[PDB]
Amino acid sequence: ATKFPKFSQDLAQDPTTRRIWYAMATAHDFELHDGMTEENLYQKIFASHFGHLAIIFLWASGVLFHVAWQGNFEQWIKDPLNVRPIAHAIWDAQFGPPAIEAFTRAGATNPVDICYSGVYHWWYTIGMRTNNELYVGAIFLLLLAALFLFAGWLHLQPRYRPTLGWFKSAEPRLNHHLAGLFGVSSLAWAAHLIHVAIPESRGQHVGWDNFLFTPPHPAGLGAFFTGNWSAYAQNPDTAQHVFNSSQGAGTAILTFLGGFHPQTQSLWLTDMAHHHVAIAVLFIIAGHMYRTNWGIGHSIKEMLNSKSFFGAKVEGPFNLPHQGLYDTINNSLHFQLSFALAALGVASSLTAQHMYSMPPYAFIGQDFTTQAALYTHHQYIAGFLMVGAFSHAGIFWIRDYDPEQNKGNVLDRMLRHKEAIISHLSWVSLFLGFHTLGLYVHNDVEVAFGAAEKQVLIEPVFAQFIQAAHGKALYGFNTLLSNPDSIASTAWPNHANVWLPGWLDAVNNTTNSLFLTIGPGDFYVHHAIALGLHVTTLVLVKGALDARGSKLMPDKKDFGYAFPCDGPGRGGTCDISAWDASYLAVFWMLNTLGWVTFYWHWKHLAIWEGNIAQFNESSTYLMGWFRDYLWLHSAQLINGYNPYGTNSLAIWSWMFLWGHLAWAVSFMFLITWRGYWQELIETLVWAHEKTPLSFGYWRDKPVALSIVQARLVGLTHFTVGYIATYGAFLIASTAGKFG
Amino acid sequence: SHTVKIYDTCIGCTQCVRACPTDVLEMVPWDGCKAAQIASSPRTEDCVGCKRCETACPTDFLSIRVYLGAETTRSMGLAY
Amino acid sequence: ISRKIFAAHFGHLAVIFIWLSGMYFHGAKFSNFEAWMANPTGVKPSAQVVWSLVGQDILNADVGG
Amino acid sequence: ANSTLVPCSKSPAFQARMKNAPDTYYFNKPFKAYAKYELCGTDGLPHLPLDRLDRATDVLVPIGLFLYVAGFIGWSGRSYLRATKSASDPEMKEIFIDLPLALQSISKAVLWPLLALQEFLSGDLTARDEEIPISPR
Amino acid sequence: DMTQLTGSYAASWLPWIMIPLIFYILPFPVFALIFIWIEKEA
Amino acid sequence: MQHVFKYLTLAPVMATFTMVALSVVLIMLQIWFPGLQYGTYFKPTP
Amino acid sequence: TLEGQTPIFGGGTGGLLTKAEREEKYVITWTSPKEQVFEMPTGGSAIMRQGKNKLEIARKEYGIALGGQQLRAKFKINDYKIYRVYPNGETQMIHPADGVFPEKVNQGRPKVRYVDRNIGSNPSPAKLKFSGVQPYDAP
Amino acid sequence: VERGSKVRILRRESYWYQDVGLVASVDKSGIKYPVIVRFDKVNYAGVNTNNFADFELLEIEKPKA
Amino acid sequence: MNISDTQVFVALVVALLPGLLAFRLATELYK
Amino acid sequence: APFPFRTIVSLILLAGNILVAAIYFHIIN
Ligand code: F6C
Ligand code: F6C
Ligand code: CLA
Ligand code: CLA
Ligand code: CLA
Ligand code: CLA
Ligand SMILES: CC1=C(/C=C/C(C)=C/C=C/C(C)=C\C=C\C=C(C)\C=C\C=C(C)\C=C\C2=C(C)CCCC2(C)C)C(C)(C)CCC1
Ligand code: SF4
């Protein structure tokens, strides 16, 4: 036996190469480690979280340091709309002179990458101006990462290891994370915006050397304590304000103008300052809801176990049995992880959907490639987070759920009508797929036969009505905010719609992405998105709810979350575990996010080209997507290098192929299965044993990858190829035609 | 090694023992079924995990269950 | 088994003969074979003609002759 | 009211498409019908809106017709399956269609909405939850 | 000139030395360290 | 002869007959009334 | 020592490997009424002798397959024994363990790994958290 | 239960859980699962018979006559 | 005007502290 | 069973949907 892995004697005694592979695959599955107790589990998780925070801080510090060292931040400040931000320098000693010339650009005298993460715009908005400030921020983040690493080490020492009760105390953690982690952090960010960001945007330098004696507002803090809060909203930035200058600049620190700054085409800094102030107040209030040490406050266990509604006998909240759930969540780390992953996925989706339509950073809405990259990035991350939420829901079902302590509650009811849930999800998926695909191919056939007028073109009237209700007067509707006489627009009792003028100006501006005009193609692609969402949810939910067992495998819970199969008996049981359901659902998540990002990218490409009619007329049939989106926009990408030379897109050209390679490799791991490779490996073992001069000999017997390992490796190759190919295409097709 | 467990629903049909390619199972005297015998797994060290025994088992649900565990040289079926 | 092989081979030969008959009949009835024979280098061979019900008659390419 | 859709007979793009269309069976009368009855977008192609109280029959007739036909097929199949349950060999009744039984099922399913309502009211439409095979939780 | 890798940033020799070190000098010793780690008898 | 009748009631044969009949009905509808669209069914020709 | 004459076999590539000399090996012995052709477990055909035959094999499954699907089923030979041989020379007869074939019930055999319940009564894994016991091993 | 009785299966892990079977025979010895039940539908292994105890069955229709 | 040689060297020296602390944390977690 | 709580919640949600549709159909403003 080997020392490695330290956490599993079963793997340590494995005499094959599998021992290594599984050692990497189960290293962070702490609950299955040998002799693991709950307290040790929680303490190790605490230290690991400290390490992950340190890693995040080091990553941010590295981004800042490389921008300050090899970027062009100060040059980009003077002309954000025409200067390409620089990510970092290129040192690839096997470049040729054509590649060196092609990658020497953006005002640099050496090969550089063009930043597409938007960090230049973000740092510009928050008031950073010089490379020295970025360097100081990088040093500070290095020190912060060091502090968190030391904290992780310290909270593993015998005196500082928290007890299990400390980890299980939910109410104080909620109070501190609502009032302090969310509220106080938001208040401090609003303070940074008011004291630093806004003065810097008004041409006034505020730093550590002078922020103590430079008040952010002429009225001072006296106006706050005397109740004269309106003084903070007086004299806002004029519509002729020039960013990073005092020309047309007001003195207000907390306005509620709404809409966009006319020049930067982004949200007002004072608007975001007031936003974070209000958010901080709300979260600090929310952080006092639960009882910790002073009697006052709700008890979550009492709320979940309550059975009386002001005297009347109810079975629970909304007359639904919620009893016993407090112990279910409080004892299941996977349940909490499922909620956390689902919340983070929804938050990432909202981030993507709200930053492109309401850009928060100066001029970032005019950096088309950056916009596309950020949207695609956060949408794909959201999809992965949703997949993880449901995977850990299934893990909870198998490992942490017991029917006895959840007898008769709402979770048990869901487990009892899982069949109806899954069948109705399947019906929704079938209806959406059948009708969406049928209408798409009907339009395909009609357009192919020279009968484009015979297409079924269903108008998205409900979403158009919502847009009109939000103030979009293009459609001719006269409802709510698009009707100036409506009670919604006037707000008759109080007329406090100080947001409405700017909001309407932003909505009806034709040069932004705020409520883009939508037609039949948008209708069809949203229904395709709904189909993808419902099928991915069906796969994940069917896996989670059947994780404990089914008719084919009644005793699945006794086999764990991830096992290959139950053999060829009973008809065959390939891909029967809930892990296999998550594996299958990753494919559908990738497909759905591909549809979503294809739609976003093609619509915005049509808008940026000035050829919105192309999308409007071609998105209603799938040949339009295949020809006018993929084939039409692949030309510059695939001409990054050719027999006539190379340009700056060459890297993307290579990566575009690289992804297609990785994707292809995935098929090998996904189509061919283990026994073939095991027999081939046996033949190779014979060959090696019978060949002279080959003094090497395996210390771990070479074996084919396991079934589950093969599925995981194939999925990893598939996803990596997917991401690399689409990212290369996105960057090349947007940057190759624009800045 | 893998774990092979026999439950009290066994009817002593001896099919799992006949189907085993490494002689993990045998038939032992019993009184819980009409056949007066039950399957046993004294030699789970030789179990490769093929699950032919489960395929052969006629009861519902299975009277014999194989749980794949720590992999050894003979459990992976390695001739090298 | 061998008798089954022999009979099935006869059946497949019948299928192939039906296919060849179809090719010859379509080249005799629904083609431009005579026009192509007149002008081999300036006429595209064509032996399939579609009906006109759902706009698929657009597939009736101008094949010359 | 909706202003981004106009009648196809008043859309210049639709008129251009109509004029440039081939003169065959597939275009003349269909284009006249679209001009008289359809609403067109700025692209000149007919669009189907669901924001009009008027022409509500244009929405209800196709939906109702399809729902009737689909319910007819479903009720025929369901009644045939329920009639074959009492037979000795229902699987053989499923690979071999019983013509009298299928004809009777189709004739009854001609009036499928009333039969479905009667079955739902009498509790005969659905089987009880405890009488349906399910998997362990 | 654009016939060679250069750097106008401070200490442009740092990539010159660090790219070889991280990518084709140290990685094989690191793999050797990991291989010794994962093959040690108990 | 009754064996041939029983064969004609086979599920594949009946499915083929039904599909052919429905396809013929739809094809004749296309031939007689080409270009029917939602919002146009059961309306007189202008 | 194990006695018997090896079957006629000109050599093959599916024979023993380093595992035979390093870890373990198996030997199947039997008696046939006549010299006849059989199939080696790892490919090729061999000729079992008139008398008592001894064959070395890399895995126990090879011997089980040869004894069951060929010796008993095809050649009506029922006296084959499978021994496990270690590099130090230790030899133990492993099949049949007690002289009676496992499929036939024999007195004195104890119940091994028997669970006194139906498979559906295994406890949920949540009950056995951090105890190290599997649901099928629970009492 | 007895021979000819119609029963509903109560064994959760059974393929025929909450399904209906027909009793074929009952063993009068002291074995754990004496009742033999036959089903119209085969399970995933193609088997249509199984042994159950009395407490795992619910009598739903007495034997004829 | 990007950072100078001295700033890069100071950042390199400073990064040693998180490196050593990360090594300490990793070795402590391995226990 | 008439399902009182279920049908009351369902009717409230349906009334909300009908009100939104009435606004959407220009029946009310
Ligand atoms: C160790 C030792 C050893 C040895 C000696 O000693 C050997 C040898 C042999 C002979 C006999 C033969 C011939 C050769 C050739 O041509 O091919 C190869 C190539 C190469 C290049 C290989 C390589 C070689 C060596 C390894 C060298 C090393 C050196 C380095 C540089 C080190 C480095 C270190 C650092 C740290 C990184 C072979 C082979 C085969 N392999 Mg084989 N090996 C081994 C290893 C290994 C591993 C790990 C794996 C996994 C990946 C495999 C794989 C494989 C396959 C698939 C196959 C095939 O097919 C082949 C055959 O069979 O035929 C027939 N195998 N190989
Ligand atoms: C879902 C999805 C979908 C939809 C929904 O919506 C549809 C619809 C449509 C409409 C609108 C029209 C007409 C209507 C009528 O007919 O009317 C009369 C009748 C009545 C009124 C009534 C009738 C009734 C019946 C007879 C009953 C029965 C039925 C059955 C059951 C069905 C089943 C059977 C089977 C099929 C055999 C049409 C048509 C077209 N299509 Mg189209 N689709 C689709 C699909 C598809 C696909 C896949 C493809 C490819 C193949 C295509 C193709 C095509 C072509 C070529 C053409 C043409 O010519 C046409 C026209 O012109 O346009 C305008 N698409 N579309
Ligand atoms: C904060 C988020 C979070 C956390 C704490 C966890 C934590 C956990 N997950 Mg989980 N998961 C998450 C998000 C998260 N996950 C998401 C978003 C998904 C959807 C993709 C999943 C999908 C998932 C599955 C399907 C499974 C887990 C499992 C586990 C547990 C064991 C981890 C393991 O296998 O060892 C560590 C594992 C690895 C290090 C995997 C290797 C890396 C993979 C192959 C990605 C490929 C790397 C890629 C090329 C580059 C990435 C960057 C590089 C630096 C690695 C552990 C409790 C497993 C479990 O509980 O077993 C029963 C399990 O089966 N999770
Ligand atoms: C192009 C690729 C593709 C397509 C079309 C589908 C289609 C489908 N998948 Mg799927 N899948 C795919 C790739 C694909 N998958 C891959 C690569 C994976 C990863 C392994 C999965 C994993 C996966 C899972 C895990 C699940 C699905 C599900 C589904 C179904 C849900 C959608 C639906 O009902 O729409 C309606 C159906 C369709 C659009 C299918 C096409 C219907 C055709 C066009 C009708 C034509 C009829 C015509 C007469 C045929 C001509 C005759 C011919 C027989 C000779 C559907 C059948 C889910 C499911 O079954 O839920 C119901 C489900 O659970 N799939
Ligand atoms: C016999 C008629 C019949 C009826 C009444 C139903 C009814 C139902 N099916 Mg269903 N189904 C049928 C046949 C039928 N099915 C067949 C033959 C198949 C195999 C292709 C399926 C496959 C199927 C799936 C995969 C799903 C359903 C679902 C459903 C439910 C909602 C969706 C729906 O209405 O149909 C949906 C119908 C389809 C998806 C395709 C059916 C179309 C076939 C070709 C109709 C065949 C008619 C038959 C040949 C008539 C012969 C009768 C004659 C002898 C008199 C509903 C209870 C869904 C569900 O569980 O929702 C809760 C679901 O996920 N069905
Ligand atoms: C996570 C942060 C991060 C990342 C991804 C990068 C990325 C890069 N750096 Mg870099 N760097 C960083 C932080 C970072 N830097 C910091 C904080 C410093 C100051 C000490 C430097 C100083 C630096 C120099 C001097 C040079 C680079 C260079 C490079 C490039 C080649 C790699 C190399 O030689 O590394 C060199 C790395 C170092 C000298 C020290 C890196 C210190 C960081 C903090 C380590 C981070 C470890 C990470 C968080 C743990 C990973 C965990 C794992 C599971 C993934 C590459 C673009 C080279 C370049 O520009 O080529 C063109 C180059 O010559 N870097
Ligand atoms: C107004 C309108 C609309 C809407 C609508 C809606 C929204 C609806 C809803 C609906 C719903 C919400 C429904 C529900 C349902 C439920 C249930 C529960 C059902 C059931 C059913 C059944 C049971 C059936 C049966 C049968 C029959 C009767 C026949 C055939 C066979 C069968 C058996 C299948 C739209 C826009 C679209 C269009 C226009 C008009
Ligand atoms: S899994 Fe295979 S080797 Fe193990 S006892 Fe069952 S039949 Fe024998």
From TrEMBL, chain A:
Annotated binding of chlorophyll a 20, by residue = 361, 377-378
Q: Which residues bind phylloquinone?
A: 677
Instruction: State its role.
Output: PsaA and PsaB bind P700, the primary electron donor of photosystem I (PSI), as well as the electron acceptors A0, A1 and FX. PSI is a plastocyanin/cytochrome c6-ferredoxin oxidoreductase, converting photonic excitation into a charge separation, which transfers an electron from the donor P700 chlorophyll pair to the spectroscopically characterized acceptors A0, A1, FX, FA and FB in turn. Oxidized P700 is reduced on the lumenal side of the thylakoid membrane by plastocyanin or cytochrome c6. PsaA and psaB bind P700, the primary electron donor of photosystem I (PSI), as well as the electron acceptors A0, A1 and FX.
UniProt: chlorophyll a 16 binding residues? 230, 256, 274
Q: Does the keyword 4Fe-4S apply?
A: yes
What is the species of this protein? Chroococcidiopsis thermalis (strain PCC 7203)
Query: Which gene is this protein's source?
Result: psaB
**What protein is this chain from?**
Photosystem I P700 chlorophyll a apoprotein A2
Q: Give TM segment ranges.
A: 50-69, 134-156, 177-198, 272-290, 337-357, 377-399, 420-441, 523-545, 583-602, 651-671
Show the taxonomic lineage: Bacteria, Bacillati, Cyanobacteriota, Cyanophyceae, Chroococcidiopsidales
Q: Is Magnesium given among the entry's keywords?
A: yes
> What are the binding positions for chlorophyll a 7 in this chain?
88, 115-117
- In this chain, chlorophyll a 5 is annotated as bound at 59, 377
Q: Which GO terms describe its cellular component?
A: endomembrane system; photosystem I; plasma membrane-derived thylakoid membrane
Give me the residues that bind chlorophyll a 15, please: 195
Q: Which residues form the signal peptide?
A: none
Keywords recorded for this protein, A-Z? 4Fe-4S, Chlorophyll, Chromophore, Electron transport, Iron, Iron-sulfur, Magnesium, Membrane, Metal-binding, Oxidoreductase, Photosynthesis, Photosystem I, Thylakoid, Transmembrane, Transmembrane helix, Transport
Give one GO term, molecular function aspect: chlorophyll binding
Q: Which residues bind chlorophyll a 30?
A: 717
UniProtKB/TrEMBL annotation, chain B:
Residues given in the record as [4Fe-4S] cluster 1 binding sites:
10, 13, 16, 57
Taken from the record, one Pfam family name reads: Fer4_7
Q: Name one GO cellular component term.
A: endomembrane system
- Judged by the first EC level, this protein's enzyme class is oxidoreductase
Give the reaction(s) catalysed. reduced [plastocyanin] + hnu + oxidized [2Fe-2S]-[ferredoxin] = oxidized [plastocyanin] + reduced [2Fe-2S]-[ferredoxin]
Q: What is the lineage of its organism?
A: Bacteria, Bacillati, Cyanobacteriota, Cyanophyceae, Chroococcidiopsidales
Top-level taxonomic group: Bacteria
Q: Which organism is it from?
A: Chroococcidiopsis thermalis (strain PCC 7203)
What name has this protein been given in UniProt? Photosystem I iron-sulfur center
Give yes or no: UniProt keyword Cell membrane: no
- List UniProt keywords, sorted A-Z: 4Fe-4S, Electron transport, Iron, Iron-sulfur, Membrane, Metal-binding, Oxidoreductase, Photosynthesis, Photosystem I, Repeat, Thylakoid, Transport
PANTHER family linked to this entry: PHOTOSYSTEM I IRON-SULFUR CENTER, PHOTOSYSTEM I IRON-SULFUR CENTER-RELATED
Sites binding [4Fe-4S] cluster 2 sit at: 20, 47, 50, 53
One GO MF term on file is: 4 iron, 4 sulfur cluster binding
Where, subcellularly, is it found? Cellular thylakoid membrane; Endomembrane system
Q: What is its EC number?
A: 1.97.1.12
Which residues does the UniProt record annotate as the domain 4Fe-4S ferredoxin-type?
A: 1-30, 38-67
Automatic annotation (TrEMBL), chain C:
Residues bound to chlorophyll a 7: 26
Q: Where in the cell is it found?
A: Cellular thylakoid membrane; Endomembrane system
Q: Where does chlorophyll a 6 bind?
A: 19
Q: Where are the transmembrane segments?
A: 5-25
- Subunit-structure text: The PsaA/B heterodimer binds the P700 chlorophyll special pair and subsequent electron acceptors. PSI consists of a core antenna complex that captures photons, and an electron transfer chain that converts photonic excitation into a charge separation. The cyanobacterial PSI reaction center is composed of one copy each of PsaA,B,C,D,E,F,I,J,K,L,M and X, and forms trimeric complexes.
Q: What does this protein do?
A: PsaA and PsaB bind P700, the primary electron donor of photosystem I (PSI), as well as the electron acceptors A0, A1 and FX. PSI is a plastocyanin/cytochrome c6-ferredoxin oxidoreductase, converting photonic excitation into a charge separation, which transfers an electron from the donor P700 chlorophyll pair to the spectroscopically characterized acceptors A0, A1, FX, FA and FB in turn. Oxidized P700 is reduced on the lumenal side of the thylakoid membrane by plastocyanin or cytochrome c6. PsaA and psaB bind P700, the primary electron donor of photosystem I (PSI), as well as the electron acceptors A0, A1 and FX.
The record's similarity note reads: Belongs to the PsaA/PsaB family.
What's the protein here called? Photosystem I P700 chlorophyll a apoprotein A1
Within the intact protein, the region shown is 67 to 131 of 782
UniProtKB/TrEMBL annotation, chain J:
> Which keywords annotate this record?
Membrane, Transmembrane, Transmembrane helix
Q: Which domain of life is it from?
A: Bacteria
- Name under which the protein is recorded: Photosystem one PsaX
Q: Where are the transmembrane segments?
A: 8-27
Q: Which organism is it from?
A: Chroococcidiopsis thermalis (strain PCC 7203)
| Record keyword Transmembrane present | yes
